[PDB]
Amino acid sequence: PISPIETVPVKLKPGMDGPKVKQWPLTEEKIKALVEICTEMEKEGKISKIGPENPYNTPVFAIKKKDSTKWRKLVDFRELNKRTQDFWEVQLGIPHPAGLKKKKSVTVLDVGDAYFSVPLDEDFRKYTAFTIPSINNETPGIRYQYNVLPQGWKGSPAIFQSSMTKILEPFKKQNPDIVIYQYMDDLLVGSDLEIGQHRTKIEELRQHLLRWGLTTPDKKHQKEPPFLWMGYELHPDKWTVEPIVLPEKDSWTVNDIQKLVGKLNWASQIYPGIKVRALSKLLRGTKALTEVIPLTEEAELELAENREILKEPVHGVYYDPSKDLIAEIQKQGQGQWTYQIYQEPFKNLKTGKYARMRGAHTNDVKQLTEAVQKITTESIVIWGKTPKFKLPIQKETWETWWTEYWQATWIPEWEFVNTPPLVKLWYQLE
Amino acid sequence: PISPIETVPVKLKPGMDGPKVKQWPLTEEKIKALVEICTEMEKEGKISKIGPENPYNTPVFAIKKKDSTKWRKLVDFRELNKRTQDFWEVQLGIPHPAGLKKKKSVTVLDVGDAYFSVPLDEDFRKYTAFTIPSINNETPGIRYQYNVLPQGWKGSPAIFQSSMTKILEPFKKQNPDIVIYQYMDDLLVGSDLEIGQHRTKIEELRQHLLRWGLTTPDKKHQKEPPFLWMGYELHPDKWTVQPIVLPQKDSWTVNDIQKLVGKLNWASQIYPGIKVRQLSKLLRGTKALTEVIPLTEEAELELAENREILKEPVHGVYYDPSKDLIAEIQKQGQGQWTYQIYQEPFKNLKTGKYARMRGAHTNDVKQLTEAVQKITTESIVIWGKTPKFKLPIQKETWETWWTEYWQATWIPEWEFVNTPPLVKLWYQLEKEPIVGAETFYVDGAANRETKLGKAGYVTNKGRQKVVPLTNTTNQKTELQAIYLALQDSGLEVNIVTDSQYALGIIQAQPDKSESELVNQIIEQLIKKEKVYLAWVPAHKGIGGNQQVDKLVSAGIRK
Ligand SMILES: COc1ccc2c(c1)N(C(=O)OC(C)C)[C@@H](CSC)C(=S)N2
Numbered sequence A: 001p002i003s004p005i006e007t008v009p010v011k012l013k014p015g016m017d018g019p020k021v022k023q024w025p026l027t028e029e030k031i032k033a034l035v036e037i038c039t040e041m042e043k044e045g046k047i048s049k050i051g052p053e054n055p056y057n058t059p060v061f062a063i064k065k066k067d068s069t070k071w072r073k074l075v076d077f078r079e080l081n082k083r084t085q086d087f088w089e090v091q092l093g094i095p096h097p098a099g100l101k102k103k104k105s106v107t108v109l110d111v112g113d114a115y116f117s118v119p120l121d122e123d124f125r126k127y128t129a130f131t132i133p134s135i136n137n138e139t140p141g142i143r144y145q146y147n148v149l150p151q152g153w154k155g156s157p158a159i160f161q162s163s164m165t166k167i168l169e170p171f172k173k174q175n176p177d178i179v180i181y182q183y184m185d186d187l188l189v190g191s192d193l194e195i196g197q198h199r200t201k202i203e204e205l206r207q208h209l210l211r212w213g214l215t216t217p218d219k220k221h222q223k224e225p226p227f228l229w230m231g232y233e234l235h236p237d238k239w240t241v242e243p244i245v246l247p248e249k250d251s252w253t254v255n256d257i258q259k260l261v262g263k264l265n266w267a268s269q270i271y272p273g274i275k276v277r278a279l280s281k282l283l284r285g286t287k288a289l290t291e292v293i294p295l296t297e298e299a300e301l302e303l304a305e306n307r308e309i310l311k312e313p314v315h316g317v318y319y320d321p322s323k324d325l326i327a328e329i330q331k332q333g334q335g336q337w338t339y340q341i342y343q344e345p346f347k348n349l350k351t352g353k354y355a356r357m358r359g360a361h362t363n364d365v366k367q368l369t370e371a372v373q374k375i376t377t378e379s380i381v382i383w384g385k386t387p388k389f390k391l392p393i394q395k396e397t398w399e400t401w402w403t404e405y406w407q408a409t410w411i412p413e414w415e416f417v418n419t420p421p422l423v424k425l426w427y428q429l430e
Numbered sequence B: 001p002i003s004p005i006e007t008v009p010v011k012l013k014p015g016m017d018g019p020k021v022k023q024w025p026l027t028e029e030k031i032k033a034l035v036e037i038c039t040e041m042e043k044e045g046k047i048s049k050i051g052p053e054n055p056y057n058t059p060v061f062a063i064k065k066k067d068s069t070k071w072r073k074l075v076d077f078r079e080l081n082k083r084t085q086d087f088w089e090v091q092l093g094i095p096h097p098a099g100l101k102k103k104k105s106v107t108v109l110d111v112g113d114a115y116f117s118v119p120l121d122e123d124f125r126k127y128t129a130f131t132i133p134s135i136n137n138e139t140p141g142i143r144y145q146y147n148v149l150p151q152g153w154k155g156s157p158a159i160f161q162s163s164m165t166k167i168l169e170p171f172k173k174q175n176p177d178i179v180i181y182q183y184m185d186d187l188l189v190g191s192d193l194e195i196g197q198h199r200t201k202i203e204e205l206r207q208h209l210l211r212w213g214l215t216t217p218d219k220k221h222q223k224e225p226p227f228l229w230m231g232y233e234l235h236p237d238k239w240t241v242q243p244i245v246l247p248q249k250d251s252w253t254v255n256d257i258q259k260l261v262g263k264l265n266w267a268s269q270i271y272p273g274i275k276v277r278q279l280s281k282l283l284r285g286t287k288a289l290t291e292v293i294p295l296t297e298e299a300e301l302e303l304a305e306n307r308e309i310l311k312e313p314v315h316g317v318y319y320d321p322s323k324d325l326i327a328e329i330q331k332q333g334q335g336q337w338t339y340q341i342y343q344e345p346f347k348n349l350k351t352g353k354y355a356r357m358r359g360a361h362t363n364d365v366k367q368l369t370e371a372v373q374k375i376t377t378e379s380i381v382i383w384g385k386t387p388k389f390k391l392p393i394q395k396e397t398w399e400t401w402w403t404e405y406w407q408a409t410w411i412p413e414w415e416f417v418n419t420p421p422l423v424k425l426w427y428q429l430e431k432e433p434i435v436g437a438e439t440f441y442v443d444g445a446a447n448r449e450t451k452l453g454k455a456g457y458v459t460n461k462g463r464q465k466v467v468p469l470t471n472t473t474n475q476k477t478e479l480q481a482i483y484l485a486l487q488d489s490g491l492e493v494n495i496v497t498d499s500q501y502a503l504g505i506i507q508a509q510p511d512k513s514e515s516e517l518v519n520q521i522i523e524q525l526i527k528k529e530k531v532y533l534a535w536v537p538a539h540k541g542i543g544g545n546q547q548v549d550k551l552v553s554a555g556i557r558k
Helices: A028-033 A161-176 A198-211 A254-267 A277-282 A299-306 A364-383 A396-403 B029-044 B079-081 B156-167 B195-211 B256-264 B277-284 B297-311 B364-383 B395-403 B474-487 B499-509 B517-529 B544-553
Strands: A047-049 A104-106 A142-148 A178-181 A186-191 A326-331 A336-341 A348-353 A388-391 A414-416 B107-108 B179-183 B186-191 B225-227 B232-235 B238-241 B326-333 B336-342 B347-356 B388-393 B414-416 B438-441 B452-458 B464-470 B492-497 B530-535
Touching: A028 B388, A161 A178, A161 A198, A178 A364, A186 A198, A186 A364, A198 B499, A254 A277, A254 A299, A254 B474, A254 B530, A277 A299, A326 A364, A336 A364, A348 A364, A364 B186, A364 B395, A396 B336, B029 B297, B107 B195, B156 B179, B156 B232, B186 B195, B195 B452, B225 B297, B225 B388, B256 B277, B277 B464, B326 B364, B347 B364, B364 B388, B364 B395, B452 B544, B464 B474, B474 B492, B474 B499, B474 B517
Parallel strands: A326 A388, A388 A414, B326 B388, B388 B414, B438 B492, B492 B530
Antiparallel strands: A047 A142, A104 A186, A178 A186, A326 A336, A336 A348, B107 B186, B179 B186, B225 B232, B232 B238, B326 B336, B336 B347, B452 B464
16 A cells, blocks of 8 residues: 655754654643544554654644634644754755745745655654643653654755655746745745736646645635635735834923933934934923923924934845844734844844734734734745744743644744833834 | 563664673672572573673672561662663653542552563663672673663663553453553552452453563452552542641751741642741752751741641542533732632632742732633643633723733633732823823932942922932832832822833832832822823933932042
8 A cells, every 4th residue: 555755864963862852731622633633644654653762752732724623733843943954954955035025925825735745764753753642641642753754844845845846847837927935834925916816826826736746735714804715915015114103293292202212212223323412402401291392493403304214224134144033022002013023133124013903802812823923924935934033921821822823834933021121112123 | 470572672872882890799698699589580581691702791789678588689770871772751740639530449550570571672681781700709700681671771661661551452442441550660440340340350450461471469459549649648539648747846957948848838739728938938048958047937937827727637539521620819918829729619629829939029910810820731731621710800900901011911711709808900100191290300329339329309390309328229229219209299290210120110010029118119109199100211311310310419420
């Protein structure tokens, strides 16, 4: 019932050992969902039980991706990639098409079921050993190894890259303006077409995708108020900056102006050539804050000059491929957050406001987790790498609820914020 | 009595080799106790004499733990344990009694000397080589190997747990609803079949096993009900802990104190109402297990208050997968809170406490929520379910510290109840500055090598003041400076702050503290009708600046 294809040898980077991670215990509903998965797939020759001679480990979750009906498996191969793939980033790079961002709209498909067909290197497999949790630590965890290419791993599409190219070929030359990035289990597809044309130009790719190898794009169905019909289309041409809003009428009171200089004071390390004295002078005196004190003659200049450094910055925009982007977010109103992806402090690379409605489920953590992805597919689309996320949240609260609103494959790296920030004030970028 | 089961494959850590030693020459009396010993061990086929041809070796200990009749031996696979490959550790903790179920009848089988039967991989055995030399080096090479998983041996416990699992696999398949658990050397068999109808399966078990290479001397079903499980004390329908006798002295060292501190905690799964707080607060000066310490009156207060509950024994019920799982949290004060998890009202499932410590200046609502998790996290670690929450916090005060706080937060199915220490917001600040209210441009400072500072203010109506301070922090000080500022204001005030630090502290609205200073402010805040703060860049321009930091001048040059 089997047809042994052959393998591309995966080996251990800079003398390292394989990941020995710990499995976050989880829901029973979910501890069930994973046996109901792993066994039917153990049947399918994909996975296999191992003995004790194997100490390696790795996280397994359980999501319901497209909606609510059936579960999805997921793995935090984050230590294996952090292991192998910083050599299989070389030996097996998959290059980032920088016109990626340049395109009108980017859709993405789980063309990831597709690597189950590739056998994995027998001698390596030990490093894909995962485990499934038992309620209350009773029964010894249900332990499996990976026989094929794990849908999680970063070293997988590395390999299947080949077949990906070969399988796309006829498509690429039928439609050449379209580019495609094979990131993760992600087939990033963009075009300069109408929201109706790129939409079709896509299915065209889906069809092709069934035929030529019964590789498969999972059915697009869900209906959120932002009318998500068919297509998870990010529109990169929408990339304009409008965060740091100076209050229109706030140069009235001592207070307003007392705000106005502090804000101007953060900006000072961002646009260093900032001039704000003759404004500050307006408040050099111990005065009542509700005192409508108008501005000085020479002060308007400092507001005006600095008020035009905004519409045109320079040398920030410099990305370093030998360093790692960091995203950091912060909460604001009921559904408006903010992120700043820098790499070396204050040197902003990309910024934005994670919005959402006023009458909507104001669940912080829905926003935060859902905010996070929105960061990420863009950070892929643009740099093709994952930001260290500096998170406004309890370790243990996140380590307890992300797995709930995480309708995504890759699990970007993360950290959690100790001290509060002033930044939030009003839309501000660190 | 060697087993006939699929052994497990072990190599030593790549690169490393098996150990080679030569043991300390021993006499007549030590060797006799060992020859005799190895022979009938070899007899049970547990070991096999090999020849000169085996390179590696290790030593033997021919101990006598208590001074009882049967001599015994042991080998410290010290060096081997260094070498041998790594395993998937089985000691992944323990299951927690709370969350266990009520399985009518139950028995435990001692699988103690049930490893020696499990066979070693056929290739590693050479490594486990040991030599039995004589008194007069007449027979230098009396050496034996080791066919089964030896005592200690890194993998032993790792493997035996695995083998046994595959062993009860069909039985657990034929006799489904009975349920086996295993750890160390204790086998717990359980069902909901009447004693004799229960003893069947146990005996069946006692036999099935016997067919696989391993014996189980247990007898007529073996041991029942009074269970000393990993310390825990368990009964067919209830659990708790048993020997827990925290004493007292007239001169303790941190040494014994640690212990005292442990017990109290341990006893905290069950006994409603325990705290360790003060007994541990004092522990801080972490010197050696030789230094003694003055048990304070605050500590003994608790040392005694806690013994009362702990004086008279509390019981623990079992989990019932259908019944509601739930918990509500009471505050024990001093940032300490106590949670109780229950299904049937007043039926104690589990209890424990959350004490926000080793990191001062913390808000209450926040702490409420912090513990909720302690629970959420723990309720899954056991019931794999989320407790419905009975919590002492109004909705409108929540909806606010939900949407007030920065660090995003989340709380599942929570419901409101009454209880004296109700939590909520004592005060809040202002968003827009106050009309007509007085505007106080505060300031502080300190002698960066001379210990002193000056706190004070100047209002907009020309209201000045200062207060010379000593043995104070540039922080404490700029903090203290707001207290004055506070004090000398009527009802609705405006404060303009020099400092980030304190501005931040007063932004969060926490409460209690050993720092009477911070507290003293709290109360001011608490009493005021409308408090508005504002903040500005220190060295830069703190408004009236020139005058402000200038009237507080002493020693500075800038
Ligand atoms: C008085 O002893 C007990 C009372 C209740 C339970 C147990 C023992 N349990 C157990 O394995 O004991 C230790 C290892 C935790 C298991 C089934 S034991 C056949 C369960 S679900 N409830």
